[PDB]
């Protein structure tokens, strides 16, 4: 907000990157393994 | 060989095995054993004795 937009400044871009990283980690926590990388297909992820 | 096995990454190892041997059958197992080469060692030691 201070920078006026995610794409307005380098710091804004990196802040938005971290923000979306944390949001996705919270959203996809069930699909994220502690150490190993979790792999899924459409049928596993219910994609039509 | 004449087999055209295909491993699916979206399947479990056990189910992939089930599918492969269901499609191909015992000839694949015979080729696998030949690759193992137990028969060669057995026959060689038997001939020696």
- Hey, how many other C-beta atoms are within 10 angstroms of the C-beta on A27? 11
Q: How far is A41 from chain B (nearest CA, A)?
A: 6
Cα–Cα distance, B35 to A23 (Å, whole number)? 51
Calpha distance B4→B23 (Å, rounded): 10
Q: Which method, experimentally, gave rise to this model? A: cryo-EM
What stretches of chain B show up as alpha helix (H) in DSSP? 13-24, 26-36, 38-48
Query: HSE-up of B38 (CA within 13 Å, CB side)?
Result: 5
Instruction: Confirm or reject contact between A37 and chain B (CB < 8 A).
Output: no
Residues from chain B that touch A41, judged by Cβ atoms under 8 A, are 10
Please report residues of B whose CB lies closer than 8 A to that of A39. 9
């Amino acid at each position: 907000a201070e920078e006026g937009g995610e794409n307005k400044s380098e710091r804004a871009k990196q802040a938005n990157a971290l923000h979306l990283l944390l949001i996705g980690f919270e959203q996809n926590r069930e699909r994220i393994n502690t150490v190993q990388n979790s792999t899924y297909s459409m049928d596993q992820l219910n994609f039509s | 060989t004449a087999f055209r096995v295909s491993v699916n990454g979206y399947e479990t190892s056990n189910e992939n095995y089930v599918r492969i041997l269901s499609e191909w059958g015992i000839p694949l197992v015979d080729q696998l054993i030949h690759d193992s080469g137990i028969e060669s060692f057995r026959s060689g030691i038997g001939l020696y004795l």
